[PDB]
UniProtKB/Swiss-Prot annotation, chains A, B:
Lineage: Eukaryota, Metazoa, Chordata, Craniata, Vertebrata
Record's protein name: Glycogen phosphorylase, muscle form
The EC number(s) this enzyme carries: 2.4.1.1
PTM description: Phosphorylation of Ser-3 converts phosphorylase B (unphosphorylated) to phosphorylase A.
Organism annotation: Oryctolagus cuniculus (Rabbit)
InterPro entries: Glycg_phsphrylas, Glyco_trans_35, Pyridoxal_P_attach_site
The reaction(s) this protein catalyses: [(1->4)-alpha-D-glucosyl](n) + phosphate = [(1->4)-alpha-D-glucosyl](n-1) + alpha-D-glucose 1-phosphate
Gene Ontology terms: biological process: glycogen catabolic process
Amino acid sequence: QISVRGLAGVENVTELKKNFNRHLHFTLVKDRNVATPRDYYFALAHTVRDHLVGRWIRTQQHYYEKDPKRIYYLSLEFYMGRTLQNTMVNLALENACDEATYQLGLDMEELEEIEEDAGLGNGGLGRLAACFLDSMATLGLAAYGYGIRYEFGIFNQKICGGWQMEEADDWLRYGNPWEKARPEFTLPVHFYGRVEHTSQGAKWVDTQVVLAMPYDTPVPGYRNNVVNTMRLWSAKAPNDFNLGYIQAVLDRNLAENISRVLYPNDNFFEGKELRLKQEYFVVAATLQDIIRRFKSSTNFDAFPDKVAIQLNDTHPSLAIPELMRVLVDLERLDWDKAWEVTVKTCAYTNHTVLPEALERWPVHLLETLLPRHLQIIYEINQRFLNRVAAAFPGDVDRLRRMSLVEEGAVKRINMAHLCIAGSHAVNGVARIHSEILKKTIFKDFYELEPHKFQNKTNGITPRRWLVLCNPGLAEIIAERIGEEYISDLDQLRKLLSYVDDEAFIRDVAKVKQENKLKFAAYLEREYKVHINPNSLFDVQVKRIHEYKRQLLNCLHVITLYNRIKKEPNKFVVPRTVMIGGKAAPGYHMAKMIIKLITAIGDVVNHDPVVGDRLRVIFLENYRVSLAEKVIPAADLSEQISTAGTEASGTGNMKFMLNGALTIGTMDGANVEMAEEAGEENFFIFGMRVEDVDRLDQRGYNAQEYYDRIPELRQIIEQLSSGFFSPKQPDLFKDIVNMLMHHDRFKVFADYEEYVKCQERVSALYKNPREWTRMVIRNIATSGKFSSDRTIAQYAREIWGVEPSRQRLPA
Amino acid sequence: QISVRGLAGVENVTELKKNFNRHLHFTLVKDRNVATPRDYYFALAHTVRDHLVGRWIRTQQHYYEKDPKRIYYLSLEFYMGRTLQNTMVNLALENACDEATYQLGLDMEELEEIEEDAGLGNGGLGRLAACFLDSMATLGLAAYGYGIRYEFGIFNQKICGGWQMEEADDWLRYGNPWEKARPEFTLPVHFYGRVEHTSQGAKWVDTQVVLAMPYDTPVPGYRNNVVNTMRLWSAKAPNDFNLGYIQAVLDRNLAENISRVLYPNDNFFEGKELRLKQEYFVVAATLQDIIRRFKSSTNFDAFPDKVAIQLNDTHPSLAIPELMRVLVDLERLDWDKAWEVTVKTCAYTNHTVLPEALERWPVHLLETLLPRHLQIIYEINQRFLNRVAAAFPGDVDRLRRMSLVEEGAVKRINMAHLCIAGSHAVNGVARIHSEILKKTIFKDFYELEPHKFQNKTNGITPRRWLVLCNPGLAEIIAERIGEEYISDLDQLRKLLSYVDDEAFIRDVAKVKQENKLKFAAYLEREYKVHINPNSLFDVQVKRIHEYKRQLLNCLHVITLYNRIKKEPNKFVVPRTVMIGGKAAPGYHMAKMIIKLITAIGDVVNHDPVVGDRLRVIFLENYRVSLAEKVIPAADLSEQISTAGTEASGTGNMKFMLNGALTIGTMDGANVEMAEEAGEENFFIFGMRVEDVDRLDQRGYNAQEYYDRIPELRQIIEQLSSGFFSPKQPDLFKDIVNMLMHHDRFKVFADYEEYVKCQERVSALYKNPREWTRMVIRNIATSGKFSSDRTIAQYAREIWGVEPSRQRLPA
Ligand SMILES: O=C(NC(=O)c1ccc2ccccc2c1)N[C@@H]1O[C@H](CO)[C@@H](O)[C@H](O)[C@H]1O
Ligand SMILES: O=C(NC(=O)c1ccc2ccccc2c1)N[C@@H]1O[C@H](CO)[C@@H](O)[C@H](O)[C@H]1O
Ligand SMILES: O=C(NC(=O)c1ccc2ccccc2c1)N[C@@H]1O[C@H](CO)[C@@H](O)[C@H](O)[C@H]1O
Ligand SMILES: O=C(NC(=O)c1ccc2ccccc2c1)N[C@@H]1O[C@H](CO)[C@@H](O)[C@H](O)[C@H]1O
Ligand SMILES: O=c1[nH]cnc2c1ncn2[C@@H]1O[C@H](COP(=O)(O)O)[C@@H](O)[C@H]1O
Ligand SMILES: O=c1[nH]cnc2c1ncn2[C@@H]1O[C@H](COP(=O)(O)O)[C@@H](O)[C@H]1O
Ligand SMILES: *Cc1c(COP(=O)(O)O)cnc(C)c1O
Ligand SMILES: *Cc1c(COP(=O)(O)O)cnc(C)c1O
């Protein structure tokens, strides 16, 4: 049908059809007469999966032969989404499979909807790991993703009476065709025990053993025949575990609980023992694999030349003392040499400056669970603080500020300080964020070792986030500039010469309209809600956090409603305001915000005077597969975090690539986005970081804004009096109290500028031609935000390896 | 190589080789360079598995079209063993696969040793279900086996310091290629709750729900292209289960524990709640399947014409009140009509007369877990006792004896009485056992309803228990009488005309010698123990129970040892005495017996004066795959239970088919075996049932035997004084105390006759020609003990269906 989806040759189509029928019969044990749509999905999945095998075996044997430097990306989260369409895209099989299934009397898009998301992450950090794997494979790097195979990923969100309910994400129920179990490569992981000091150094003894069983998932590069591996560990009890009899067998669950469920708290660090076990589990098993592979090529001098370990946040920070443990205790290397190797091997990426999110493990937990690692941490700390004292003699306060050990009621280990000490590179994820790191929370470390600190601005893969989710846009772009931009997104700059092209303007606007029509139909079919497809699609999708300020969006929505009620017969640009995202289960305020959004919707959507001029919809169960649907349909992207709080954002980039304009603060990657597109092509508002700082020094008084802005006062009165909850008039008292007395994120301070900026958005939307021209200027300058660019910078500036777009033989 | 293993045609061999290579590549994702023997096993397994698919689909669709009466065999145990060789045998693929693998440079027998046993049973009852499935498929019956997919089967037995240790049987660790998960056919099972009485009858409400997910395993008939299904249920938590958040997800384990582990207690009934849950779980899920299939053909009059349910012991006895529940509560049938349907549908098989093994569930457990079923049981009981009162007016003691409710400190439900009341047929498993049922424990029920009581003497499948495990014997038999005996074992009678045939005598003896050589080599390679292959292989393998009297065997062994020590320079027939079997983990005496056997071995095997004239070996981890090795190697089969205690035995039949002579009491199927072969061709000794009865009336005094038999006294003195345990002289005091003061099984009473009979065995073994001639007379008359005969009797006399050896189209 469309060019970017590849060739549908007679020979390929015939072959796909017969392999489909073979799998239906031999693999699924069904015949056409009782087969369901799910059976058909699995037959297709197995058929496409077959095409990965040869490339996967030969990629991995190629690495064994050529022995390049290996990149190990350690993460507790890999937010992969669906795999079927992505595999077809990267293998150039999409049109062929579409034709093959059409000829068998099936709709491939319907079959694609059956696949469960691999929801093994919370949001941005987990999705970044997924985009990175795609880019590393596309750039021909010998890269491995290592994590945990959670039996249950991020919870499915149900909305009941306006409240979030959580249910288990049983994503493995029907099986996972994309994983290959490797029980033969099972490895032991140790917990508890005690440290014994012999003549020949320390020994960790009397441990409890949990087995780590790997499951391998292929990661195909874009049309380069490279297939890398994501290896995820599953927890298994040893066979003599607890070995009255029946209870001992049932107690195996205790060991296997390690890989049972993803922790869904993305707001606040909680020192839970099970989480600590997960963190060590992934680290201990992974490092054995790394070392095995390094030995199968005595001398650890060459270790950093052959191995890079990237830590996705501090979550796998135990890699640093674990590497030291193995090198010192098992390999008998001297401390200083082991430390040199460790530092040159490890690099650390930070994802937030919010103090409550930083990992600070109680010493008493580490003492019980990992006694040897605590000893090693103490020794790392002593040697590090000796270096600080020599560099800054007499600066006693610096010593306590930089210590890996935090003093207080409970002693804690600062995992971020551990990561900086033990890594040769530390990076933030957007230019402003990396600057904030050097000026604020890690200032002392930057002064000691300035060379360690880098920036690596985030990116997204243009495969999933353009070609897969928005084929209509990919095609109209390809018609003008060819197909090379898919693996070289900078080429989108060529589209600037089409900003005055009448055909292209019309095509861009047509693709958006079709996407909006498709999404409007999806909302009725799956959720029974009606929307006007001619309205401006105003979208804020991301996890629910106070710093992300969904509340500020709520205030604007109520303002528009109140303005309509005040002057009903005046014209306003119709809007469909869509807010979606999950709240961490223990985050009370976030759960209240969800309830507020639905409550606003209940009043607004049923007011006859409003009509179809304003609609407020909460998008339930926001996840990767839903993002692929809503983002192509969006007109306006809400990126409205308080300046200095959102480290980067990546959703922002997805919307820019897909033809939405952005209303945003100068925060995270928004700054660089506006810089690329031009500030005149961006809807920028609000305090800058400097203005926030000035307000903090003076003290933030919300009452001032309430007193001086009548429209804001009205909203607060409505909230307080029970206008949005007639049967429970005090329902939103917590929200009001927070806004008035303890708002860390200064919602009121940005309100006026936000409302004014929103008026400028509505004004431009009235001029479809000028709206679309500005859209073209955004799409054309989105190239920097490809994760291919990001990964190439990691490769060259941190890992010390060269990327290549060169094909492996098919 | 050998004829009975089928053809190895050029076309088949070429096809098997390429499909093997395809699976290695596409299914296992390996290449020849890093593939291990386990990978090669799985490639072969998948290759053979492919050949089952077409036949499986067409057998099941054939049943849907022809709508025959369906047989449902309900069991908590299916002791299947390995599947690969059995599948090859039944499909006539063995020689072809042997050649195919040979040409790829592999040894198929080595690959076969990699497969784990499916150890989903304890012993005879579980293995009977497995033999029955094979025979039902071979006789073309529309039969389904329904049970539980235990994650852990019967424990692996390790011997440490002479003691049994149990470890988890993690049989699913590497995957199971023989099962097909059917998550789409998941069904709900209800527990707890309460009973509500409305105008429209009773309702069971406020229940907890556990999901039952089926896994299907193919059961191929012998070369008839029939492939039946064994459906095993796995427990799954519903997605809103317990739905702080983390704990709720981890608590899903509580629901899923239902199918976690097989209960290994085969001696003593224990009223454990988890076991009750298992029993209802299998029954509730199975009955929904039965009813669904019956409806997919309103009128339940025809239900018994289309459905037979066979209860393997009382373990699935809840089927009776569950069927009543569904018919009365859900389908709205009147009680009397539902009861008529239930009785005509169900039949019950008893496997023991020992009172401690009978299921007697505390009322308080049923009240909490299954409140509606308890109400139904009470109602069944009232109506049943009304019938008894009308038949035997004024007989008040009969009423309390026959009641399903047992009075006492704790009220209990007698599940056996429930089964008799609710079944149209009740059978024992050997003629003497069925007679004992009618004369003793079920006498009252027999007097009320004599027509219900039947005999169905047990059998074993000649596929697994001759062709598979003893191909050498199968071949020499086939050379003389052809191949038809494999599915018509009565044809073995033709071998009587070869009893004086010199060539055949030599061939029978040669096959035995080769089997003994092969097993002697196995013992050295896998267990590092040396044996004389020229000695008489004296074998007792079965679960360790007091009634089975492994202790009597022990007494004989010590007698031979003491006789040798008394007259060292006298000639005795050399013996290798092999005892093997698992003890239930909580059965203290059985664990002591194992320790005694190893302790005897420790003294006997290291006495220089003994030499290689006597060896005592405990066969560790006795299971189906080990039985297939040891049984073909045996010369003497020990079947020495106290008369009236072993309901049938089936091991006895396996040994008879494989060319061993039997030393046994007139117990269980031994009686019929001796009747078939002729008493002159059997080594019969000891008390008959009548003699045991006479001894009980008088009172059994063990002291009498101790006082009057000097050789017995010596052994007891040796045991008491610490001759077999020098460092713990009182180790065996429990054994001695039991033998002297509370032996339910009269070990001393059979001692003299047993020892004398053993002398007659040794005498015959000195004459190899006459030994072998008697062996031929045994093999020739073993035909009755085919499970094909057993199943044909069930079919005709209980289920009301005709068997057929007719092929389905390939
Ligand atoms: O589709 C599957 N088919 C079988 O296991 C299968 C196929 C044919 C069979 C023929 C005879 C007997 C068993 C069979 C099982 N298995 C599924 O494979 C998935 C992807 O590898 C895996 O995730 C599932 O756990 C498994 O059920
Ligand atoms: O998603 C993020 N964090 C999490 O999901 C997360 C996960 C586990 C946590 C555990 C304890 C405390 C905070 C946690 C946050 N961070 C986001 O990372 C993106 C990728 O760099 C970035 O664009 C966002 O600005 C950042 O908030
Ligand atoms: O052998 C298996 N292979 C795969 O799952 C497989 C094969 C090829 C693949 C290619 C690319 C990505 C994943 C793949 C998985 N799976 C096993 O199938 C068994 C039998 O059906 C089942 O019991 C095991 O659970 C499963 O690991
Ligand atoms: O194996 C048997 N029983 C068990 O394994 C078993 C299983 C679970 C139990 C639970 C509670 C009490 C006893 C149990 C026995 N019985 C044997 O059945 C054979 C087949 O009919 C028969 O040949 C044997 O004589 C009988 O002991
Ligand atoms: O010992 C070896 N001999 C030959 N090939 C090997 C060996 N070790 C690893 N390989 C190849 O490297 C691939 C990946 O190995 P892994 O990354 O260590 O798991 C395998 O699939 C093999 O093709
Ligand atoms: O609804 C039906 N239409 C056609 N075939 C069916 C239908 N129901 C069952 N079958 C056939 O019967 C087989 C076994 O079904 P089951 O025993 O009910 O699980 C299936 O594999 C089908 O081939
Ligand atoms: C991209 C993405 C995110 C990250 O969005 P931000 O707006 O950067 O927080 C979160 N969830 C999903 C499902 C995503 O795809
Ligand atoms: C046949 C068999 C049994 C039954 O043996 P009996 O001697 O009849 O108790 C027990 N276990 C296994 C593994 C068997 O094969």
